[PDB]
Design a protein around this ligand. Structure first.
Ligand code: ADP
Ligand code: ADP
Lengths: 371, 73, 407, 49
């Protein structure tokens, strides 16, 4: 659980009122909690599992209540299963609690292994929203139709008899908002978000690449409604690395039924992509991210400078004008550096000239080369 | 380097054991004894004779080799 | 410009505030501290355990069995001494623990115990009493499909000859062994599927698995390729043993190009380990000892790349080609894909097929889906021929995607 | 049959004329003593006892 989002950002008493509303509610929480049976069930089960209980691994289930369990010493024991253990929650590789004296299975322990993919499960999408992105409307509708609508409303596709699209590639110059759009769609539909950065699936170990992608899809399907993001797919996209490609392509198209997990893959060099990975059967949605135009640039300037204190003299149009020379990330860079420049000369209220010299210096640092 | 069964607490040897190589190694040996006759192979008669004189003849006799003094292949 | 002296930041963050600053930051710190107080007051969240619905379980039988039975350890059997066959004596290996000489129980029988055989044993006397199944590697046993895909042969379009010839080998002998045995013929035992990507090879594998009725095991290239040496060969050994356990079995390799790469040496040893795994496989398919009732399916996008020993008949007896669908095949697959949708009755599909270039069946499903999204984005509950033509245009132009090198 | 086996192990520094350090096989090392009658000069680090 998390706090509500207070949506004035200028210092106004509306922001205050929302805040003291929240304080009121949390204070009622405090009040309520401070102003303060099944011993039969406990006396049977939690006394049968006499403390302490060891933790081991389940290998096989042989009978209805008989299973093989290994422990951290590595020994193997054919033990019985007490009736209260959920059989459907038991499978090879599962962590199981065991009676200390007689090693009898006394319950399943929720998994705490596979650390790395557990970290890349992130789920920490809520920093952005479709709000934070402006002007990418065509891309927004495309990705909504491809991945967001089938997750939010698969009813349309099931009623239509349609098997939903099962792969999306995002492409364009860097800093156009591909990663931002992926995070934003992860935020709009609260399906679990999976991110893995390109080259990081390339590994020294021969198996580790395909193994890593296999376990990532395994955890994704385990979370069921999930979105997996591979940024800079080019690192793999453009024998061992080709074998990781084959693993990913078969995880996309191949045997079994994948189900609900969606795949977003972002590239900066789409034309260098190999034909196999761009599967017409799987990857039917390619979304271009062009360099922002005048309207989009204006929207990005408003979005980013919105949280900054601004003077009256700022004429945003001369910043917007000229051509499509730069992307949204460059716009954020101009906003930030204009903030610093206003800070040096001691303005907490950035002016037009600040942005003018900021864009000039950025264009100086933008590209290079002898005449 | 011998296999011996000892007392489980006092560790006194009270049995000798046949040396155990490995479960896999015991899996490698043939017990089914397949049935493909030599006549079932066609055209390879020269190679069949080569293999037979190299392998089977040292098994069956050992006299025609020693009478010469050769080391069998 | 001089750096920000402490007074300068002080006045910067004081003069520029609204007349609200103090209140709302203090209120935010109270937000944080009250959140932490709530968290400490409610305590940590119960992680819990299994504990199936309460009415389902327990009975005094649970505790009675717990206090009556024995938590048997598991030991590899070995070298039945059989010194006099009136009491045979056995050797057991408790992994990472010890090696013992033991005897049977009053319950089990000498015929019930074999060498190896992965037996169970008591915890203090170490007397043997239970017949346990052998150790199958979990990452090999999850490979069994355990669930048929929702695809039948009728869903495959155009490739009548291919499906007929593949069913001749993977389905007919299992379904009708009498035809082969009474005519006295040995059916083929290995079928290779090759063709361009997206032609329906994996779809045919899914259809076979759905109609197999026998034990069907999928296999993917990544599964075999472990990191440690010999381990992939080990898994294939266990996989073929598992297949032998079943009364007949079907083995499917998807994209065998991942492992079947032709052996090469001059590349400073090359990949080698993958070659070793495919060599263990090439032996298992046909080496010493008959393979058994194991019919095997491989599909690949690079038929020429696989090692010639793997192409060899007797291991890959029948090779099938899935080419780009013809006009009739394109019409048939368009029909098949359009069965599931809510569309106009008068969609002249053969027109769409002849608009299609040399498009694989994956392209056909893609254009059908793109028509689906056209209809849905139009909110119409019926897909129209106009939707199908826009879908064709979209898919074809997207695949087509300066270029002054042209003419 | 009444006989009981004895744990083998290599020895280490002698702390005094009575107390020694012995590394019992692959297992852990202990601080032990000579029985009563054995030599004392011959027990140097690296004697199987
Ligand atoms: N349309 C946009 N709206 C808002 N921010 C944008 C936009 N395009 C780019 N950005 C900025 O650029 C960054 C995202 O760059 P992005 O193109 O997602 O990286 P990548 O090229 O690695 O995918 C974000 O910090 C974001 O603030
Ligand atoms: N002849 C066909 N009939 C029906 N559907 C087909 C046909 N060819 C391809 N498809 C569709 O396109 C996809 C092709 O995938 P497939 O070619 O089996 O993958 P791979 O090339 O990896 O074996 C299938 O999911 C199937 O739905």
């Amino acid at each position: 659980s998390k706090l509500p989002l207070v949506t004035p950002h200028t210092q106004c008493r509306l922001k205050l009122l929302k805040l003291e509303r929240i304080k009121d509610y949390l204070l009622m929480e405090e009040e309520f909690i401070r102003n303060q049976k099944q011993e039969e069930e406990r006396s049977k089960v939690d006394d049968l599992r006499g403390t302490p209980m060891s933790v081991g691994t389940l290998e096989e289930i042989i009978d209805d209540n008989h299973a093989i369990v290994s422990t951290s010493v590595g020994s193997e024991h054919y033990v019985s299963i007490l009736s209260f253990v959920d059989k459907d929650l038991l499978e090879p590789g599962c962590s199981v609690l065991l009676n200390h004296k007689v090693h009898a299975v006394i319950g399943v322990l929720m998994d705490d292994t596979d650390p790395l993919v557990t970290v890349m499960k992130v789920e920490k999408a809520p920093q952005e929203t479709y709000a934070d992105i402006g002007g990418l409307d065509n891309q927004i509708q495309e990705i909504k139709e491809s991945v967001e609508l089938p997750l939010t409303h698969p009813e349309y596709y099931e009623e239509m008899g349609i098997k939903p699209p099962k792969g999306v590639i995002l492409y364009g110059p860097p800093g156009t908002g591909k990663t931002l759009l992926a995070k934003a769609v992860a935020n709009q539909t609260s399906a679990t978000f999976l991110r893995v950065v390109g080259s990081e699936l390339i590994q020294k170990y021969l198996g580790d690449g395909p193994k890593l992608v296999r376990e990532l899809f395994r955890v994704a399907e385990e979370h069921a409604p999930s979105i997996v993001f591979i940024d800079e797919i080019d690192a793999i996209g453009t024998r061992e690395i080709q074998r990781t490609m084959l693993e990913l392509l078969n995880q996309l198209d191949g045997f079994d039924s994948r189900g609900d997990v969606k795949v977003i893959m972002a590239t900066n060099r789409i034309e260098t992509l190999d034909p196999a990975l761009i599967r017409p059967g799987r990857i039917d949605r390619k979304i271009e991210f062009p360099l922002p135009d005048e309207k989009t640039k204006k929207r990005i300037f408003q979005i980013h400078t919105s949280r900054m204190t601004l003077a009256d003299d700022v004429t945003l149009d001369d910043l917007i004008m000229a051509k499509d020379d730069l992307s949204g990330a460059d716009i954020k860079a101009i906003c930030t550096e204009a903030g610093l420049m206003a800070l040096r000369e001691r303005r907490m209220k950035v002016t037009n000239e600040d942005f003018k010299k900021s864009k000039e210096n950025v264009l100086y640092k933008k590209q290079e080369g002898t005449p | 380097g011998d296999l011996v069964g000892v007392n489980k607490d006092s560790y006194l040897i009270l049995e000798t054991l046949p040396t155990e190589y490995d479960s896999r190694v015991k899996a490698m040996e043939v017990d089914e004894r397949p049935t493909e006759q030599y006549s079932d192979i066609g055209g390879l008669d020269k190679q069949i004779q080569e293999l037979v004189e190299a392998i089977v003849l040292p098994m069956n006799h050992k006299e025609k080799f020693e009478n010469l003094g050769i080391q069998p292949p | 410009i001089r750096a920000l002296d402490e007074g300068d930041i002080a006045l910067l963050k004081t003069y520029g505030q609204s007349t609200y600053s103090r209140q709302i930051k203090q209120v935010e710190d109270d937000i944080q501290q009250l959140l932490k107080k709530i968290n400490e007051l409610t305590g940590i969240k119960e992680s819990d355990t299994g504990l199936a619905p309460p009415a389902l379980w327990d009975l005094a039988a649970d505790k009675q069995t717990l206090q009556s039975e024995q938590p048997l350890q598991v030991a590899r059997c070995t070298k039945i001494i059989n010194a006099d066959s009136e009491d045979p004596k056995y050797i057991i290996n408790v992994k990472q623990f010890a090696k013992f000489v033991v005897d049977l129980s009053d319950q089990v029988a000498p015929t019930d115990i074999e060498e190896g055989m992965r037996v169970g044993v008591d915890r203090n006397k170490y007397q043997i009493h239970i017949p346990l199944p052998p150790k199958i590697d979990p990452t090999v046993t999850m490979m069994q499909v355990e669930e048929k895909p929702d695809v039948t042969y009728s869903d495959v379009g155009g490739c009548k000859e291919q499906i007929e010839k593949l069913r001749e080998v993977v389905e007919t002998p299992l379904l009708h062994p009498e035809r082969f045995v009474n005519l006295g013929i040995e059916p083929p035992k290995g079928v290779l599927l090759f063709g361009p990507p997206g032609t329906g090879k994996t779809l045919c594998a899914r259809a076979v698995a759905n109609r197999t009725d026998a034990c069907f095991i999928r296999v993917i290239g990544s599964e075999l390729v472990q990191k440690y040496v010999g381990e992939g060969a080990r898994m294939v050994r266990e996989l073929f043993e598992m297949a032998r356990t079943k009364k007949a079995c079907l083995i499917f390799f998807d994209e065998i190009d991942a492992i079947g790469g032709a052996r090469f040496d001059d590349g400073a040893g090359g990949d080698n380990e993958v070659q070793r795994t495919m060599l263990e496989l090439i032996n298992q398919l046909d080496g010493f000892d008959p393979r058994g009732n194991i019919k095997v399916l491989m599909a690949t996008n690079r038929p020429d790349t696989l090692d010639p020993a793997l192409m060899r008949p007797g291991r890959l007896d029948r090779k099938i080609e899935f080419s780009l669908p013809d006009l009739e095949g394109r019409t048939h697959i368009f029909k098949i894909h359009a069965r599931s949708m809510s569309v106009e009755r008068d969609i002249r599909f053969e027109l769409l097929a002849r608009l299609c270039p040399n498009s694989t069946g994956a392209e056909i499903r893609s254009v059908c889906t793109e028509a689906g999204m056209f209809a849905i984005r139009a909110r119409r509950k019926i897909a129209t021929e106009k939707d199908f033509l826009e879908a064709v245009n979209k898919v074809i132009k997207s695949y087509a995607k300066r270029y002054m090198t042209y003419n | 049959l009444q006989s009981v086996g004895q744990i083998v192990g290599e020895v280490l520094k002698q702390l005094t004329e009575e107390k020694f350090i012995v590394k019992a096989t692959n297992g852990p090392r202990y601080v032990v003593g000579c029985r009563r009658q054995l030599d004392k000069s011959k027990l140097k680090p690296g004697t199987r006892v």
